[PDB]
Amino acid sequence: QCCTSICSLYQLENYC
Amino acid sequence: QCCTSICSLYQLENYC
Amino acid sequence: QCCTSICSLYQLENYC
Amino acid sequence: QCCTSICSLYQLENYC
Amino acid sequence: QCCTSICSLYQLENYC
Amino acid sequence: QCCTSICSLYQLENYC
Amino acid sequence: QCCTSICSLYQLENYC
Amino acid sequence: QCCTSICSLYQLENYC
Amino acid sequence: IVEQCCTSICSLYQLENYC
Amino acid sequence: IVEQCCTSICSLYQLENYC
Amino acid sequence: IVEQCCTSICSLYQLENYC
Amino acid sequence: IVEQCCTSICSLYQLENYC
Amino acid sequence: IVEQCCTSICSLYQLENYC
Amino acid sequence: IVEQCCTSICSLYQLENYC
Amino acid sequence: IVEQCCTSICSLYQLENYC
Amino acid sequence: IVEQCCTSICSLYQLENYC
Amino acid sequence: HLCGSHLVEALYLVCGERGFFYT
Amino acid sequence: HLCGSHLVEALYLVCGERGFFYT
Amino acid sequence: HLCGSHLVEALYLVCGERGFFYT
Amino acid sequence: HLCGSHLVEALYLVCGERGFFYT
Amino acid sequence: HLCGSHLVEALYLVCGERGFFYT
Amino acid sequence: HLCGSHLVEALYLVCGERGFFYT
Amino acid sequence: HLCGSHLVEALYLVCGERGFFYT
Amino acid sequence: HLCGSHLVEALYLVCGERGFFYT
Amino acid sequence: HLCGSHLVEALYLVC
Amino acid sequence: HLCGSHLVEALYLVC
Amino acid sequence: HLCGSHLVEALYLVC
Amino acid sequence: HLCGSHLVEALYLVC
Amino acid sequence: HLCGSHLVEALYLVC
Amino acid sequence: HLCGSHLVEALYLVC
Amino acid sequence: HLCGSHLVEALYLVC
Amino acid sequence: HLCGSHLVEALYLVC
């Protein structure tokens, strides 16, 4: 239950 | 239950 | 139950 | 029950 | 029950 | 019960 | 019961 | 339950 | 597409001898 | 696409001898 | 794409002898 | 993309002899 | 991308002899 | 990207002899 | 990126002889 | 990046003979 | 009354040109 | 009343040009 | 009443040009 | 009433140009 | 009432140009 | 009432140009 | 009421240009 | 009421230009 | 396997 | 395996 | 394996 | 393995 | 392994 | 291993 | 290992 | 190990 941002996430990543 | 952003997600990633 | 963004998702990823 | 965005999704990904 | 966006989906992906 | 977008879908994908 | 978009679908995919 | 920032996340990282 | 072709010409367009 | 082709020309467009 | 091609020309466009 | 190609030309565009 | 190519030209664009 | 290429030209653009 | 290449040209752009 | 390359040119841009 | 007027939709499934073309 | 007027949607699934082209 | 008027959506799945092109 | 008017969305999945191009 | 009007979203998944280009 | 009007979001996943370019 | 109006977000995941460029 | 109006966020994950550039 | 051994392909253009 | 041993491909253009 | 041993590819352009 | 031993590729351009 | 031994690649451009 | 021994690559440009 | 012994690469540009 | 012994690379530019 968040506003204008991420919440309850686990993993986030770009890669190169 | 979020507004204008991600929530309850698990994984997010670009790749290259 | 979200507005103008993602919610209840699990996986999201581009690839190349 | 979302507006102008994704919800209840599981997987989303481009590929190349 | 969503407006002008996806909901209750499971999988979505381009490929190449 | 959605307007001007997809709902209750399961799978969607281009391919090539 | 949707307007000007898909609903209650299961599978959709181009191919080539 | 956060506003305009990340919460409940576990991992985040760019890479190159 | 699979141009799995060996030991001869394949997919040529214009082989020419102009003179 | 798989141009798995050996020991000959493959996917040529214009081989020419102009003179 | 896999241009797995050996011991011959592959994917050429314009081989020419102009003179 | 895999240009796994040995002992011949591969992916050439314009080989020419202008004179 | 893998230009795993030995003992020949690979990925050339314009080889020319202008004269 | 892997230009794992030995004993020949690889990734050239313009080899030319202008004269 | 891995330009693991020996005993030939690799990644050249403009080799030229202008005269 | 690994320009692990010996006994030939690698990553050149403009080799030229202007005259 | 469920939906209004002047509604527009356009779904394209286009696996375009494939093969060899020498135009 | 569920949705209004002048609604627009456009979904493109375009695996465009593939193969060899010598235009 | 669920949603308003003049709504717009556009989803693109575009695996664009692939292969060899000599324009 | 759930959402308002003039809503806009645009999702792009674009694996653009690949291969060899000699324009 | 859940959300207002004039909402905008735009998600891009763009694996852009790859390969060899000789423009 | 959950969220207001004129909300904007834009998520970019851009693995841009890769390979060899000779513009 | 949870959040207000005119909210903006922008998340960029940009693995930009890679490879060889000879502009 | 949880959060106010005119909120802004911007998260950048930018592994910028890599490789060889001869502009 | 795609092709055998001792393969030859001779091409002659003359003017 | 794609091609064998002792392969030859001779091309001659003349003017 | 992609190609064998003692492979030859001779190309001659003349004017 | 990609190519064998004693490989030759001779190219001649003349004007 | 990618290439063998005693490999030759001779290129001649003349004007 | 990528290449063998006694490799030669001679290139001649003339005008 | 990447390359062998007694490798030669001669390049000649003339005008 | 990257390269062997008795390696030569001669480059000549003339005008």
Contact flag X22-O11 (C-beta cutoff 8 Å): no
Q: What SS3 state is found at T11?
A: strand
| M19 contacts chain AD (CB < 8 A) | yes
| O17 contacts chain AD (CB < 8 A) | yes
Closest CA to G10 of Q10, E11, T12, D14: E11
CA AF6 to chain CA mean position, Å: 9
How far apart CA P7 and CA T7 sit, in angstroms, is 62
Closest CA to Z7 of AD8, M4, Y4, Y2: Y4
How far apart CA S22 and CA S2 sit, in angstroms, is 51
* Beta bridge pairs of residue V16: none
Across C1-16, the runs of DSSP E, i.e. the strands, are: 11-12
**Which sign does the torsion angle of CA A16, O8, K8, L14 carry?**
positive
CB proximity list for M6: less than 8 A, separation 6 or greater: L6, L7, N5, N6, N7, N8, AB2, AB3, AC2, AC3, AC7, AD2, AD3
- Are residues S13 and G12 in contact, defined by beta-carbon separation less than 8 angstroms? no
Structure tokens at AA10: 């001779």
Altogether, the residues listed in chain Z come to a count of: 15
Q: Give the residue on B whose Cα is nearest the Cα of W1.
A: B3
| E11 contacts chain T (CB < 8 A) | no
* Beta bridge pairs of residue H1: none
Across Y1-15, the runs of DSSP E, i.e. the strands, are: 11-13
Closest CA to N15 of K13, AE15, O14: O14
Reported as half-sphere exposure (CB side, CA atoms, 13 A), residue A6 has a value of 21
Altogether, the residues listed in chain I come to a count of: 19
Taking one residue from I and the other from Q, the number of pairs with CB-CB distance under 8 angstroms is 4
Angle at Q13 between CA U16 and CA R16, to 5 degrees: 35
- Are residues W5 and X6 in contact, defined by beta-carbon separation less than 8 angstroms? yes
Q: Point out the residue among O6, O7, O17 whose CB comes nearest to the CB of AE15.
A: O17
How far apart CA AA12 and CA V16 sit, in angstroms, is 41
Q: Give the residue on W whose Cα is nearest the Cα of B16.
A: W15
Contact flag Y8-Z13 (C-beta cutoff 8 Å): no
How far apart CA L6 and CA AB3 sit, in angstroms, is 6
Contact flag Q15-G14 (C-beta cutoff 8 Å): yes
Closest CA to Z7 of A7, B3, L7: L7
CA R2 to chain CA mean position, Å: 25
Beta sheet of U8-15, edge-to-edge order: Q8-15, R8-15, S8-15, T8-15, U8-15, V8-15, W8-15, X8-15
Cα Dmax for chain G: 32
Contact flag L13-T18 (C-beta cutoff 8 Å): no
Altogether, the residues listed in chain E come to a count of: 16
AC5 contacts on AB by Cβ (under 8 Å): 5-6
Q: Point out the residue among E1, E11, E14 whose CB comes nearest to the CB of D15.
A: E14
Amino acid identity at N4: Q
Closest CA to D4 of Q4, T2, G1: T2
For chain Z, positions 1-15, list CB contacts with chain K under 8 A: 2-3, 7, 9, 13-15
- Are residues J15 and I15 in contact, defined by beta-carbon separation less than 8 angstroms? yes
How far apart CA W13 and CA U14 sit, in angstroms, is 10
DSSP string, AB1-15: ----SS-B--EEE--
Closest CA to W13 of U11, T12, C5: U11
The method of structure determination was cryo-EM
T6 C-beta neighbours (distance < 10 Å), count: 17
How far apart CA W5 and CA O17 sit, in angstroms, is 65
- Are residues C11 and B11 in contact, defined by beta-carbon separation less than 8 angstroms? yes
How far apart CA D16 and CA B15 sit, in angstroms, is 10
Closest CA to R21 of S19, J12, V23: S19
Closest CA to AB11 of AC14, M1, W4: AC14
| J1 contacts chain S (CB < 8 A) | yes
| N10 contacts chain V (CB < 8 A) | no
| Residue from AE1, AE7, AE14 whose CB has the most chain AD CBs within 10 Å, to mutate | AE7
DSSP string, E1-16: --BSS--S--EE----
Contact flag V15-A16 (C-beta cutoff 8 Å): yes
- Are residues F14 and R14 in contact, defined by beta-carbon separation less than 8 angstroms? yes
Touching pair AA, L by Cβ (3+ pairs < 8 Å)? yes
Contact flag C7-D2 (C-beta cutoff 8 Å): yes
- Are residues O9 and M10 in contact, defined by beta-carbon separation less than 8 angstroms? no
How far apart CA L6 and CA M8 sit, in angstroms, is 6
S2 contacts on E by Cβ (under 8 Å): 1, 3
Q13 contacts on R by Cβ (under 8 Å): 13
Contact flag AB12-AA7 (C-beta cutoff 8 Å): no
Touching pair Y, I by Cβ (3+ pairs < 8 Å)? yes
Please give the backbone phi and psi of residue O11, each rounded to the nearest 5 degrees, phi first. Answer: 70, 20
- Are residues D15 and E15 in contact, defined by beta-carbon separation less than 8 angstroms? yes
Structure tokens at M8: 């020949």
- Are residues S12 and T9 in contact, defined by beta-carbon separation less than 8 angstroms? no
**Which sign does the torsion angle of CA X2, E3, S8, E16 carry?**
positive
CA distance readout (Å), Q21 to G15, I13, K1, L1 = 20, 10, 17, 21
Contact flag H5-X18 (C-beta cutoff 8 Å): no
